[PDB]
Each structure stands twice: as C-alpha cells, then as structure tokens.
Design a protein around this ligand. Structure first.
Ligand SMILES: *[C@@H]1O[C@H](CO)[C@@H](O)[C@H](O)[C@H]1NC(C)=O
Ligand SMILES: *[C@@H]1O[C@H](CO)[C@@H](O)[C@H](O)[C@H]1NC(C)=O
Ligand SMILES: *[C@@H]1O[C@H](CO)[C@@H](O)[C@H](O)[C@H]1NC(C)=O
Lengths: 89, 119, 36
C-alpha cells in the first residue's frame, strides 16, 4: 500500500470533519538548570512606615527610611559588623 | 593587504547538535577570574592601565562581577586561542594560569566598601 | 586528521610567582569599615 494518504477536509462537512489545529506543549520542572521561569506581578514602593518588604527574595519587616550611603554599582545588599541586613538597593 | 579581515576559521569543521546560542559585540592589564559552581559559570575581570615590559607586576586590585550563565556544562578542561596575521605570524604575548584552591582570606572593607587589603 | 602548522619550536615553559593576587569580591554584598 502507500502509508501516506491525503486528508479530504471540505468546508461543507460537519464540524468534526472540519480541521482542528493541535498545539502540544510539554515543559519541564525542577530539572535542567533553567532560563525560562513563570511570569510575575509587582506592587508599589512605600517608605517611612513600619511595613513588610520583599526585595530580591530577601524577606524582612521594618521602617524603610531614606538611605544616606552609596554602594558599588553591582552590589545589592549592605550589612553591619553583626551580620544583619540593614541596607538594600 | 589597510584593513583587517578574517578569512580562515580553524576552530571546528562543523557541528550538528546545538543547544544554546548568544550574540553581542567584542599596554593592557586584563585580570580575569573564571568560576564554574553548580553549573552557574561566573566570571570576574579587571582592566588596568599598566605600562611595563615583563613578568607579573606587584600591586593589588579587587575584581568585579561580569556575567552568570545558568548553564549546566560540566567543564573539565579548556584552552586559549589567538589570531594570526599574514607562513604564519603569532606575536609576543604573556598570559598566566594558576588554579585556585579553597583557601580562607581575611578582607578589609573601608567605608567605600573597596577592598583595600586582604591577608 | 587535519592540516596543522609546522616549524613551531616548543620552548620549555617557565614559572613565575604571584604577588597579592586572587582578591575578588566574594559576593554581591556591600560592607563598610569592617573585617570579614
Ligand atoms: C549529534 O549529532 C550526530 C550526527 O552528526 C548524531 O549521530 C549524534 O547522535 C548526536 N548526538 C546527540 C547527543 O544528539
Ligand atoms: C554533566 O553531567 C550530567 C550528569 O551526568 C549531565 O546530565 C549533563 O548533561 C552533563 N553536562 C555537560 C554537557 O557536560
Ligand atoms: C566614597 O568615597 C568618596 C570619596 O572619598 C566619599 O565622598 C564618599 O562619602 C564615600 N562613600 C561612602 C559610602 O563611604
């Protein structure tokens, strides 16, 4: 025989016999060190009140007063002698 | 021939199975430190205006971060490649390699957070 | 195999010494007037 036969899609058939585009997606989790993550949404920037914050995964609560020190332009954190986060870009 | 054009490309003949691709744009003291930790391939560099003749100068300098590649290549070896001008003509260059070891240092941060000395 | 350059006199490599080298910021964190 011939393994390949043609389709006979016609416009005047039933919706079943009319074509359907099938887009399959198979994605991986927790394996193959990643470069595509899921999406994300933001909130606002509030200061000077006793608030909760989350910057760059670092979680903590406190008052976000204006800062008075500048860091090196790649550094994200700023810490004290007691090794406690007290500054962040 | 006054222009600099590249003709012969002897790195590899060809390939089939490509998995990642990147594109961008490419006297000297260019100090590099390469790292490969948990697949994350971090590199540091320092470009410094020297003017001298020969074997490694003294002096200290911190190194800055450049790039983090979340690849998962288990790099076991490497090599350096140069370019030649035209029978061949290489040049006269110096480049140093010394493998790092898991040591422990003490760092001296100043108010500016510049590392001004380490022991 | 392939074609390769000849007349490449391999002169034996020589050693040198480092001088206060391998000092890079270990992380992405600012500190000030401390020792760590
Ligand atoms: C790489 O490509 C060759 C064909 O050039 C193939 O035989 C080999 O199986 C491929 N390897 C992988 C890992 O895909
Ligand atoms: C490294 O080894 C792991 C486990 O065998 C393998 O999954 C990974 O593909 C390898 N990476 C490369 C390309 O060196
Ligand atoms: C960094 O250095 C400059 C010049 O000495 C100085 O004006 C500035 O206050 C310093 N910043 C910090 C955070 O110490």
């Amino acid at each position: 025989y011939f393994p390949l036969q043609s389709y006979g899609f016609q416009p005047t058939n039933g919706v079943g016999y009319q074509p359907y585009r099938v887009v399959v997606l198979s994605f991986e989790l927790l394996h193959a060190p990643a470069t595509v993550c899921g999406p994300k949404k933001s909130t606002n920037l509030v200061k000077n009140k006793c608030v909760n914050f989350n910057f760059n995964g670092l979680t903590g609560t406190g008052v976000l007063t204006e800062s008075n020190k500048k860091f090196l332009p790649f550094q994200q954190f700023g810490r004290d002698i007691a090794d406690t986060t007290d500054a962040v870009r | 021939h006054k222009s600099w054009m590249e003709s012969e490309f002897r790195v590899y003949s060809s390939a089939n199975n490509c998995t990642f691709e990147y594109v961008s744009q490419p006297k000297n003291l260019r100090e590099f430190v390469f790292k490969n930790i948990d697949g994350y391939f971090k590199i540091y560099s320092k470009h410094t205006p020297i003017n001298l003749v020969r074997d490694l100068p003294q002096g200290f300098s911190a190194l800055e971060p450049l790039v983090d590649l979340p690849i998962g290549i288990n790099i076991t070896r490497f090599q350096t490649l140069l370019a030649l001008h035209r029978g061949w003509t290489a040049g006269a260059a110096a480049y140093y390699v010394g493998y790092l070891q898991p040591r422990t240092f003490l760092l001296k941060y100043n108010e500016n957070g510049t590392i001004t000395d380490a022991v | 195999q392939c074609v390769n350059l000849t007349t490449r006199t391999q002169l034996p490599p020589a050693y040198t010494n480092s001088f206060t080298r391998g000092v890079y910021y270990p992380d992405k964190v600012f500190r000030s007037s401390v020792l760590h």
